[PDB]
């Protein structure tokens, strides 16, 4: 199978709806915690379901791409969008991105963000605010949603 119109209104299935502010982190987490709990619970399981007289089993691989830049910054334990560290895929500063502009590599991930937050909270090297931020590459919050590093085409086009 392959979806013919992946960006159409006919393929996205609603799963959880709420009337809450996007940046209101407390209620955002309060509402979205159960879904992430089920996601992590079923990421390593097998589903047996009856299909037309023959039982069949299902695996599941999840890719999170449909988040805009502000959502990624908020839910991946990152700073605001106007920070020195600009890209949610690599650990490079805005200035250094301006002098080089060509060569890079994706190195950010959810587990790496979690351990960077752990380092930030524990302060295991006895450093100040600036040194610790330079150590953690801009991580100052605990992420709670796992997404893959990807680019949103619509908002990329709008910004360009």
């Amino acid at each position: 199978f392959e979806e013919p119109k992946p960006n159409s209104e006919l393929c996205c299935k609603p799963l959880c709806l709420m009337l809450a502010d996007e940046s209101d982190h407390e209620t955002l987490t309060a509402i979205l915690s159960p879904l992430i709990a089920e996601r992590e619970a079923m990421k390593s399981s097998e589903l047996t379901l009856e299909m037309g007289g023959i039982p069949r089993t299902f695996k599941f691989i999840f890719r999170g791409t449909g988040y805009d830049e502000k959502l990624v910054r908020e839910v991946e334990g990152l700073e605001a969008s106007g920070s020195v560290y600009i890209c949610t895929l690599c650990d490079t500063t805005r200035l250094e991105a301006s002098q080089n502009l060509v060569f890079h590599s994706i190195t950010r991930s959810h587990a790496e963000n979690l351990q960077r937050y752990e380092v930030w909270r524990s302060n295991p090297y006895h450093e100040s605010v600036e040194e610790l931020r330079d150590r953690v590459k801009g991580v100052s919050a605990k992420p709670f949603i796992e997404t893959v590093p990807s680019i949103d085409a619509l908002h990329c086009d709008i910004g360009n």
Partner: protein, 344 residues
């Protein structure tokens, strides 16, 4: 008995219910902001100042060896007496509970410049489970200082928790804990006079006794008018805990405690029932081995406080509290929480 309005700076949207006001050498500070700390204040602690009824929340840096700590939304604060401050547990912004202990102290001070010092204390033994709304106080018995800890509200255990009831909360067991600060040890003790759980109560410390009164029991949806006195002695061997039930208690929950005079405390604000509000103040006069609770004069509340549903606050320390009333709607932003100060 004086009530006044205090304004806010440009950081009104940074005060949320469940904060904690911590005082050092007559200087009061803020803790428990809303949202994860931004670049404007990476430390997370704030400078609380009232001058001509106005608030400016200047940040406050930490020490080099300090550990940067998450915003606790319902912690348990203690005032140890070479001065330190104790906070244990509570809700983090992502709504998961923590079971670790943070110790506060003022590392150094310049001309109107303050730096804190945060250390993480790990407990071994019968570690209390993560919870929030609990109360922590300290006792001084025969040259030994050690703090007592009581139960509050906690999520279901990791074996009886479902996604459909992920955020459901049940009261902790009424076990009385004895946590040692200078050794990081705890011994769990069970006392027969304490059968039902208690949450969001107010506790008062003295020489060698703690008075826990009020509190909400979620098991039967009542607020008992209870009053327990806990006595601690420190022999060579294991410590002993004895609890006695005293008459004349009050039925309050999530109230605010502050000190007016020596051996003098006052309870201001709180909840009497689900839809009822504690509109009176109770003067609790402590002594050597006696307790007496009487009703003081009712302060003149404004219509905004009288017709609201939620207020919250903490202790300033110098005979003053800081209670908050929600203001207007949220979409119109700007002024969203009306803040008041009360003089005792």
């Amino acid at each position: 008995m004086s009530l006044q309005m205090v304004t806010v700076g440009h950081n009104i949207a940074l005060i949320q219910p469940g904060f904690s006001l911590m005082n050092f050498d007559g200087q009061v500070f803020f803790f428990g902001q809303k949202g994860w700390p931004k670049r404007s204040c990476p430390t997370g602690v704030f400078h609380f100042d009232i001058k001509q009824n106005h608030l400016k929340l200047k940040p406050a840096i930490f020490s080099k060896d300090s550990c940067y700590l998450p915003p606790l939304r319902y912690p348990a604060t203690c005032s140890y007496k070479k001065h330190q401050y104790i906070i244990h547990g509570g809700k983090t912004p992502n709504n998961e509970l923590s079971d670790k202990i943070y110790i506060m102290s003022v590392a150094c001070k310049n001309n109107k410049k303050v730096t804190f010092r945060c250390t993480e204390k790990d407990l071994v033994g019968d570690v209390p489970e993560p919870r929030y709304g609990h109360s922590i106080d300290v006792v001084y018995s025969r040259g030994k200082s050690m703090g007592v800890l009581f139960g509050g509200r906690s999520y279901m255990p990791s074996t009886q928790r479902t996604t459909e009831k992920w955020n459901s909360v049940a009261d902790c067991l009424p076990h009385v804990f004895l946590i040692d600060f200078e050794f990081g040890c705890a011994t769990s003790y069970i006392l027969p006079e304490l059968q039902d759980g208690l949450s969001f109560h107010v506790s008062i410390a003295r020489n060698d006794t703690v008075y826990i009164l009020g509190g909400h029991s979620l098991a039967s949806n009542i607020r008992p008018a209870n009053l327990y006195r806990i006595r601690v002695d420190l022999p060579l061997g294991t410590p002993a805990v004895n609890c006695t039930v005293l008459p004349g208690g009050i039925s309050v929950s999530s109230a605010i405690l502050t000190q007016t005079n020596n051996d003098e405390f006052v309870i201001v604000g709180g909840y009497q029932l689900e839809n009822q509000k504690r509109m009176v103040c109770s003067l609790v006069s402590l002594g050597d081995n006696t307790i007496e609770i009487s009703e003081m004069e009712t302060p003149d509340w404004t219509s905004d406080i009288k017709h609201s549903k939620i207020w919250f606050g903490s202790n300033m320390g110098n005979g003053t509290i800081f209670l908050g009333i929600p203001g207007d709607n949220k979409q119109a932003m700007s002024e969203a929480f009306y803040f008041y100060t009360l003089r005792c």
